[PDB]
Amino acid sequence: KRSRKESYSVYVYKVLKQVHPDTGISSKAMGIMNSFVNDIFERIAGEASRLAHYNKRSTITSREIQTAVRLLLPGELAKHAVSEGTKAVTKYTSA
Amino acid sequence: KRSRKESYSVYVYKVLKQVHPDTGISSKAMGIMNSFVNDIFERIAGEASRLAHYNKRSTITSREIQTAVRLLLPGELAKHAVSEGTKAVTKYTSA
Amino acid sequence: ARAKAKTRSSRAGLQFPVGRVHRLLRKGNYSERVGAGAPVYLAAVLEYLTAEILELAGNAARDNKKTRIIPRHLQLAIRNDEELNKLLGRVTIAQGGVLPNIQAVLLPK
Amino acid sequence: ARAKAKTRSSRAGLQFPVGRVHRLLRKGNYSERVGAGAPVYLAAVLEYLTAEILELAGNAARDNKKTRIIPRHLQLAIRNDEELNKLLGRVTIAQGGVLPNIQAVLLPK
Amino acid sequence: SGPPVSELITKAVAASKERSGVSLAALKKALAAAGYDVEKNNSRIKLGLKSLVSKGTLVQTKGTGASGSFKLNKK
Amino acid sequence: KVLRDNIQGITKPAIRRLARRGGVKRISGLIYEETRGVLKVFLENVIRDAVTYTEHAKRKTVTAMDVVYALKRQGRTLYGFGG
Amino acid sequence: KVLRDNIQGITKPAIRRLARRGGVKRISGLIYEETRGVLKVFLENVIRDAVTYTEHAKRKTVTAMDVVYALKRQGRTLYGFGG
Amino acid sequence: KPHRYRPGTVALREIRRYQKSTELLIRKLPFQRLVREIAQDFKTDLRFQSSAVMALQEASEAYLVGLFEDTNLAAIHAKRVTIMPKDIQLARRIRGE
Amino acid sequence: KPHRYRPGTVALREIRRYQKSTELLIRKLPFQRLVREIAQDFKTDLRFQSSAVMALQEASEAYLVGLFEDTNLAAIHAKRVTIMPKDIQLARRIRGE
DNA sequence: GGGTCCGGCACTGGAACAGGATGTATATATGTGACACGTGCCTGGAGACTAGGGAGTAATCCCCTTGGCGGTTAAAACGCGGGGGACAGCGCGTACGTGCGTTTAAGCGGTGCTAGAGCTGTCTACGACCAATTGAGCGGCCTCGGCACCGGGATTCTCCAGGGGATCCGGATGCTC
DNA sequence: GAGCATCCGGATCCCCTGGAGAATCCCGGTGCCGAGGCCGCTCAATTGGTCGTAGACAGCTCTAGCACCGCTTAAACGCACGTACGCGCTGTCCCCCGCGTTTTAACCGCCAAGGGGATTACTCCCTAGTCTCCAGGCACGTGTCACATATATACATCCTGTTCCAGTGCCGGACCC
């Protein structure tokens, strides 16, 4: 009897097959990516927690997620990231 | 009147009375010490949150505060802080 | 009787589980109260970062004519981009190695 | 029939506000709950740190024949103790300046 | 009294007489081995070598000024 | 109204006196524009973060709070202006 | 069980190979003892952090998670060990 | 004949002078104009608290002076006392910037 | 006469070879023994899982290799090809430890 | 006829080009085990409704921020000069580089034991929440002495203008041819 | 009798010290404004009771980690030859401190006017919570082909011989005295 451990494996596999149908991965680099998603998530989420506590807002909002993304990510990644995120959240609100 | 601004000024002043009954302190350095208390407070609080999450503990206890005090403070500061804090909590549990 | 099950990532059209990261933000205690659009937004951001780093890794692997990603490819991808280098400066990848960097004074003649 | 309102800093024998620290960790969102001994412990360690800093600051003030402490004296305090230097290496005091430090090659023969 | 440094330098350049000129470090160590306070006489040996090369009794091989290697004249 | 050349407003003897605060004895001519540039980079990097903090605040004024806050995020937290 | 002199257990050619990783052309023979010293200092700091992490957990065995966690709080993050 | 000190002796004296000092070195108005100028290229119509631009100002000489002992160590490393921008580039590259 | 390359060329070939390489570079068992050796001093009877030891291995190698590009920058800075312990020391000092 | 000065030539030092050795790269064969795909399941995600509250927005004021105007001078700007380094070259001593052999201990494969990791169940200690109420904590305000600025006199630092010792150079002296 | 060797004393240059000036240090003096303390207020701390719930512990399994053991070389190490730097020193050129004068805009201070900071009142959008349901992701099993490894060619590259060009020192001739 074992305990299942959560991860992000199949989702990164789906992203790989979307960007490259015919390429593989190593399991070590897969652990690299799972830790990568966790670490970048922790950075962005900690920035959002700080931005929430700063202006006396007890609610984290996608607006301050946007400020955190523009904060941590320098340059071109920020403008791309806000682009897919705005179209994604408009798609979410539309359905 | 006005809404208030929470501070740590007079506590630094009365600690000055405890350690040096004769000397005074400037308001600029007093704001520095309020910044100092907030900075060390948020560092220890953040490490407390990490040690809580990391063992899947959702109670902030005195023990991981002791570990984080050991962890951030180097050496002599850490050990004397452990001694003084254990002294304080033994007086606290003894009402 | 009840509506057909449809995950919110699919309604967004995104690949990482928005529900899972939403739960992880709930139990991270990074806020008392969490809005609906923020996990979708965060998921989309992580998808763009993963998409760009994997396309860089895929071109690196195609350069090395290996079909499968090795952490050497991932190190070469993350370090040959100056902007991701600024994003991930103080980190080393396990079994990553380093970029080819030889200084001109070390070369002969 | 309620008992006399005494303070938890007093039963702790401490002067830093233990209840205020307890409140600020309660609304700081670092866990769902906090034990009783943790804010007492953190108020204790903060009080020791401030006692150390201001003891060195008052000694530096007496060094400069002054009964009033300037942030310059805080520089002479923290930057001349290596353990506090390791505590606060990355911080700068506003209107504080730097210790007098001259490299040995700079002085003439 | 004692002989001045110039005769010692002529003996130093005549001591080895390899194909290139004798160097400044080699002549300093030659003065140290024969017996001389080379530590406090750096300006002295500089002016002496410049004075002797100005007469043409010894000629410069490669260097400029006090640097380089030093070898005796044609005759 | 608009401004074009304020990097020359950080003058030569002021940079010199800063180098005295750094303990630098003698300062070459090519130093000056390099210090101006690295000053420009550090300032733009912090003020961009600060103005994003203000845009989060929906506030048209740069406050000392967000300056201390952005310098805290950039690993150079400053003492004496919090609160 | 007792180990005393494994500080010399890292060999001289191992330090040469790390120097080749660092792009060192010519390495001095005097480098090795101070590299061993700074290596011991860095390991001492990180395992001090790690043993505090594990004695918090009341565990006598330290994990890779604790290693990457301690290196995370030091600002020398690694990836790929459950972090 | 007017007196004239050897160079560096004066320089060491004002090193001691401003180093025992605690006051500001850079003029606040041209620098504050520079702050408005660099803020202008991102969003128009910004306003600045006086204490805010001052706090940014001590942040400025803080980073500058720290880079300066960095470059001072770099310059004495090369057996020199003259500072060159190549030392500054070294300091920026070791600092991670 | 048997063949022999000039100094540095073999070293530069080692640079290309090992920098192209990705494998773990220090010996596993003596380094693991050293980690235990340091480990008894702070707490007795400490046990290791192997992946933690490889993690410390890669961490040590990463910290060292970064210090060696730092000292290469220092050696170029002092117009040298050799690093000397003051190069490493000033690398430590500018990194702020 | 000797002394000296110039030109040439052959000997030696230092560059251009082919050639061998070798390590590194490329082509082809082979197994294997880690990548990948299919299954069971079950928990983690989701749909609906409810409660409740954090927050968006109108309003206001005020105060703190921005704009402008006169005066003074400290600081900036420019120029002359002079001096301290920057740095290139050369050479010498040395300190690793590398290439051989040797010892060994790391590395690999195999096996037993266990101690701790970890999972499950208890349940008791303990923390969160909330009505009520108070005393410490902060805004406001007001006085004063420690201190910032001002001025006068010593002291230490700096730099430059005279004295002492070593050195080099020229003249006297003796000796020998 | 004089040409040369030698010795000895005088000029000269570098080092070595005393005195003048000046920048800072130290001793009074004055008026000022931050600070410390009184005072009023009001709000978060405190008590106490309850309610739920979460971590500490007992116990039980099972997993990889520790220990032991036997081959088997890759590497650790040492030594010796050798070549390639580190740096010490100085020559030389040049670039930048220092000091003075002239300019200029910074600082101050003085005054007007309003932009949004900040707070309050309101009313409403949004989202934790909970019960229920069901399906995608992960443990698990398996199978299987890109890749690690081995082996046979091919070429770059790197050092060296060999071959030609240039410097130069020594020898031969010519001039001049």
PDB file of C-alpha atoms in Angstrom, chain B:
ATOM      1  CA  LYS B   1      -9.012  63.698  14.337  1.00  0.00           C
ATOM      2  CA  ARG B   2      -7.372  60.977  12.243  1.00  0.00           C
ATOM      3  CA  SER B   3      -7.070  57.250  11.814  1.00  0.00           C
ATOM      4  CA  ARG B   4      -4.015  55.887  13.607  1.00  0.00           C
ATOM      5  CA  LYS B   5      -0.699  54.451  12.390  1.00  0.00           C
ATOM      6  CA  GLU B   6       0.437  51.371  14.329  1.00  0.00           C
ATOM      7  CA  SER B   7       4.064  51.562  15.402  1.00  0.00           C
ATOM      8  CA  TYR B   8       6.787  50.151  17.630  1.00  0.00           C
ATOM      9  CA  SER B   9       8.308  53.419  18.867  1.00  0.00           C
ATOM     10  CA  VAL B  10       7.755  53.588  22.627  1.00  0.00           C
ATOM     11  CA  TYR B  11       8.793  49.958  23.010  1.00  0.00           C
ATOM     12  CA  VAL B  12      12.220  50.785  21.575  1.00  0.00           C
ATOM     13  CA  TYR B  13      12.236  53.810  23.894  1.00  0.00           C
ATOM     14  CA  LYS B  14      11.487  51.736  27.009  1.00  0.00           C
ATOM     15  CA  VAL B  15      14.073  49.120  26.011  1.00  0.00           C
ATOM     16  CA  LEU B  16      16.491  52.061  25.811  1.00  0.00           C
ATOM     17  CA  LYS B  17      15.405  52.926  29.352  1.00  0.00           C
ATOM     18  CA  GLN B  18      16.187  49.330  30.348  1.00  0.00           C
ATOM     19  CA  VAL B  19      19.650  49.192  28.796  1.00  0.00           C
ATOM     20  CA  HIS B  20      20.818  52.839  28.903  1.00  0.00           C
ATOM     21  CA  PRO B  21      18.891  55.095  31.310  1.00  0.00           C
ATOM     22  CA  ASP B  22      20.817  58.246  30.387  1.00  0.00           C
ATOM     23  CA  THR B  23      20.982  58.465  26.586  1.00  0.00           C
ATOM     24  CA  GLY B  24      18.504  59.532  23.925  1.00  0.00           C
ATOM     25  CA  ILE B  25      17.445  58.507  20.438  1.00  0.00           C
ATOM     26  CA  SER B  26      16.595  60.426  17.269  1.00  0.00           C
ATOM     27  CA  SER B  27      13.281  60.115  15.443  1.00  0.00           C
ATOM     28  CA  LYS B  28      15.012  59.079  12.209  1.00  0.00           C
ATOM     29  CA  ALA B  29      16.701  56.146  13.949  1.00  0.00           C
ATOM     30  CA  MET B  30      13.368  55.429  15.631  1.00  0.00           C
ATOM     31  CA  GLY B  31      11.748  54.953  12.231  1.00  0.00           C
ATOM     32  CA  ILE B  32      14.776  52.837  11.322  1.00  0.00           C
ATOM     33  CA  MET B  33      14.041  50.610  14.292  1.00  0.00           C
ATOM     34  CA  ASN B  34      10.372  50.322  13.330  1.00  0.00           C
ATOM     35  CA  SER B  35      11.576  49.203   9.893  1.00  0.00           C
ATOM     36  CA  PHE B  36      14.014  46.822  11.620  1.00  0.00           C
ATOM     37  CA  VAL B  37      11.320  45.216  13.760  1.00  0.00           C
ATOM     38  CA  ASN B  38       9.056  44.844  10.726  1.00  0.00           C
ATOM     39  CA  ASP B  39      11.868  43.349   8.599  1.00  0.00           C
ATOM     40  CA  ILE B  40      13.022  40.770  11.148  1.00  0.00           C
ATOM     41  CA  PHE B  41       9.364  40.073  11.973  1.00  0.00           C
ATOM     42  CA  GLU B  42       8.473  39.317   8.359  1.00  0.00           C
ATOM     43  CA  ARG B  43      11.618  37.220   7.832  1.00  0.00           C
ATOM     44  CA  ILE B  44      10.900  35.052  10.871  1.00  0.00           C
ATOM     45  CA  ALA B  45       7.189  34.899   9.992  1.00  0.00           C
ATOM     46  CA  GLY B  46       7.966  33.775   6.446  1.00  0.00           C
ATOM     47  CA  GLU B  47      10.370  31.085   7.622  1.00  0.00           C
ATOM     48  CA  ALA B  48       7.731  30.013  10.154  1.00  0.00           C
ATOM     49  CA  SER B  49       5.187  29.675   7.343  1.00  0.00           C
ATOM     50  CA  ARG B  50       7.649  27.640   5.273  1.00  0.00           C
ATOM     51  CA  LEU B  51       8.493  25.283   8.151  1.00  0.00           C
ATOM     52  CA  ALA B  52       4.776  24.942   8.873  1.00  0.00           C
ATOM     53  CA  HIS B  53       3.937  24.083   5.246  1.00  0.00           C
ATOM     54  CA  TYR B  54       6.961  21.820   4.845  1.00  0.00           C
ATOM     55  CA  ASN B  55       5.930  19.377   7.576  1.00  0.00           C
ATOM     56  CA  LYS B  56       2.260  19.856   6.543  1.00  0.00           C
ATOM     57  CA  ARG B  57       1.644  21.588   9.873  1.00  0.00           C
ATOM     58  CA  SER B  58      -0.948  24.322   9.964  1.00  0.00           C
ATOM     59  CA  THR B  59      -0.260  25.572  13.514  1.00  0.00           C
ATOM     60  CA  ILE B  60       2.511  28.072  14.219  1.00  0.00           C
ATOM     61  CA  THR B  61       4.108  26.594  17.348  1.00  0.00           C
ATOM     62  CA  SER B  62       6.992  27.794  19.498  1.00  0.00           C
ATOM     63  CA  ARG B  63       9.199  24.933  18.299  1.00  0.00           C
ATOM     64  CA  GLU B  64       9.546  25.922  14.650  1.00  0.00           C
ATOM     65  CA  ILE B  65       9.991  29.519  15.789  1.00  0.00           C
ATOM     66  CA  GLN B  66      12.960  28.206  17.779  1.00  0.00           C
ATOM     67  CA  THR B  67      14.245  26.389  14.689  1.00  0.00           C
ATOM     68  CA  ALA B  68      13.817  29.449  12.463  1.00  0.00           C
ATOM     69  CA  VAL B  69      15.526  31.665  15.050  1.00  0.00           C
ATOM     70  CA  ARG B  70      18.416  29.187  14.982  1.00  0.00           C
ATOM     71  CA  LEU B  71      18.190  29.120  11.202  1.00  0.00           C
ATOM     72  CA  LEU B  72      18.330  32.836  10.347  1.00  0.00           C
ATOM     73  CA  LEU B  73      20.370  34.251  13.213  1.00  0.00           C
ATOM     74  CA  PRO B  74      24.034  33.190  13.088  1.00  0.00           C
ATOM     75  CA  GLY B  75      25.671  31.442  16.020  1.00  0.00           C
ATOM     76  CA  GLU B  76      25.871  33.350  19.297  1.00  0.00           C
ATOM     77  CA  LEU B  77      22.758  35.411  18.527  1.00  0.00           C
ATOM     78  CA  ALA B  78      20.882  32.182  17.839  1.00  0.00           C
ATOM     79  CA  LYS B  79      21.967  30.373  21.009  1.00  0.00           C
ATOM     80  CA  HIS B  80      21.404  33.357  23.308  1.00  0.00           C
ATOM     81  CA  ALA B  81      18.042  33.965  21.646  1.00  0.00           C
ATOM     82  CA  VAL B  82      17.136  30.334  22.347  1.00  0.00           C
ATOM     83  CA  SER B  83      18.184  30.719  25.994  1.00  0.00           C
ATOM     84  CA  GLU B  84      16.295  33.984  26.522  1.00  0.00           C
ATOM     85  CA  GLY B  85      13.203  32.831  24.633  1.00  0.00           C
ATOM     86  CA  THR B  86      13.026  29.553  26.534  1.00  0.00           C
ATOM     87  CA  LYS B  87      13.336  31.584  29.739  1.00  0.00           C
ATOM     88  CA  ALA B  88      10.484  33.811  28.549  1.00  0.00           C
ATOM     89  CA  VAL B  89       8.177  30.936  27.612  1.00  0.00           C
ATOM     90  CA  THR B  90       8.840  29.162  30.916  1.00  0.00           C
ATOM     91  CA  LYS B  91       7.758  32.344  32.694  1.00  0.00           C
ATOM     92  CA  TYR B  92       4.767  32.609  30.341  1.00  0.00           C
ATOM     93  CA  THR B  93       3.496  29.082  31.023  1.00  0.00           C
ATOM     94  CA  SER B  94       3.968  29.740  34.751  1.00  0.00           C
ATOM     95  CA  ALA B  95       1.548  32.726  34.474  1.00  0.00           C
TER      96      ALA B  95
END
